[PDB]
Amino acid sequence: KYRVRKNVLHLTDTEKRDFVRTVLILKEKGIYDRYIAWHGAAGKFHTPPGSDRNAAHMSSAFLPWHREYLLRFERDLQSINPEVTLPYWEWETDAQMQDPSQSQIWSADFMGGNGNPIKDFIVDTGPFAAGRWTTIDEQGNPSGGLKRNFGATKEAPTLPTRDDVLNALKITQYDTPPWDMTSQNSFRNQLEGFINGPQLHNRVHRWVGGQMGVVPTAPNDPVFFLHHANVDRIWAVWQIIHRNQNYQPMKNGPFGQNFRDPMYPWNTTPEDVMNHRKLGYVYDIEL
């Protein structure tokens, strides 16, 4: 209830500055890489082995996994600067623009801009530009700096619309068997973006491109957390709307996907994080 997560575009110049500086500190201390690694490791952890489900994606645990992910991350933010909370990128609103790359989120004082085509789409503006921000690859070894390539792919030329979000919120069931990419009438799978994909969450990843378009490397871009803060907001909206609806599956799903199964790489269960207000934060739209 205490911590307010604000729309990025509604942040003050000081708020934008403080967040960035805090993220940079986390990076310098070595704390930020933990999250990159955590995300990568979970992607390789299949539930069960052989299937295309993993601890963090393509299954029911997708939403609670990332909520815990962001929760831990926001806590680390506060440990540096107690006035700093995790803001969210409301991409569905930016989709209304003729050129979403002109959105203030991509300004030099915050996330920085698109990749430079002349420099192989290396980001050379903002606080996370090359020579200011080092990235790591799939193996955990140093890369060559952050990359972005907005709407370059055929599959995801645009950002998800407000309509896309509203249609997702209409879904009655949190998730359906067989709790994977093939799940239908599943809010989880729809929001994740596999219903006629890439949509919503998956579409944003592919739209940004660079490290964000690739699962093991995605958190190398700070906008990852901004993205998923919005995803976690949409989920929280859905929960309030459908309060008679609960997490699925409760039982008999793959291990790691059930209501009280531990979510690798943590002992945290989906139940632990089903109530976001209990976790000590709220989105500004709730006020």
Amino acid identity at 112: G
Among 44, 170, 260, 278, binds a copy of itself (CB under 8 A): 44
- CA separation, residue 272 to residues 28, 252, 256, 275, 276 (Å): 30, 19, 13, 8, 9
| 262 interface partner picked from ligand Oc1ccc(O)cc1, a copy of itself, none, CB below 5 to 8 A per type | a copy of itself
> Is residue 255 a contact point for a copy of itself (CB under 8 A)?
yes
Among 256, 272, 276, 282, binds a copy of itself (CB under 8 A): 256
Please report how close the Cβ of residue 18 comes to a copy of itself at its closest, in angstroms.
23
| 29 interface partner picked from a copy of itself, ligand Oc1ccc(O)cc1, none, CB below 5 to 8 A per type | a copy of itself
Please report how close the Cβ of residue 38 comes to a copy of itself at its closest, in angstroms.
7
Nearer to ligand Oc1ccc(O)cc1, 53 or 57 (CB): 57
> Is residue 205 a contact point for ligand Oc1ccc(O)cc1 (CB under 6 A)?
yes
Contact range with ligand Oc1ccc(O)cc1 by CB under 6 A, out of 21-29, 157-165, 200-208, 279-287: 200-208
> What does the block give as tokens for 71?
């929760």
Q: Is the peptide bond before 178 cis (omega within 30 degrees of 0)?
A: yes
> What does the block give as tokens for 33?
């890489």
Radius of gyration from C-alpha coordinates of the chain? 18
* 3-class DSSP state of 203: helix
Among 8, 77, 136, 152, binds a copy of itself (CB under 8 A): 136
Among 7, 189, 202, 239, binds ligand Oc1ccc(O)cc1 (CB under 6 A): 202
Place of tokens 């209990």: 278
* 3-class DSSP state of 156: coil
Among 218, 223, 236, 273, binds ligand Oc1ccc(O)cc1 (CB under 6 A): 218
Please list, residue by residue across 136-163, b when 16 or more beta carbons sit within 10 angstroms of its beta carbon and e when fewer do.
beeeeeeeebbbbbbbbeeebeebbbee
Please name every residue paired with 116 in a beta bridge, in sequence order, or none if there are none: 122
> Is residue 215 a contact point for ligand Oc1ccc(O)cc1 (CB under 6 A)?
yes
- Rounded to an integer, what distance in angstroms lies between the CA atom of residue 60 and that of residue 182? 12
Nearer to a copy of itself, 29 or 119 (CB): 29
Contact range with a copy of itself by CB under 8 A, out of 31-39, 101-109, 171-179, 275-283: 31-39
> Is residue 31 a contact point for a copy of itself (CB under 8 A)?
yes
- CA separation, residue 122 to residues 147, 221, 260 (Å): 4, 12, 42
Number of residues that bind a copy of itself (CB under 8 A): 29
Please name every residue paired with 136 in a beta bridge, in sequence order, or none if there are none: 142
Nearer to ligand Oc1ccc(O)cc1, 16 or 210 (CB): 210
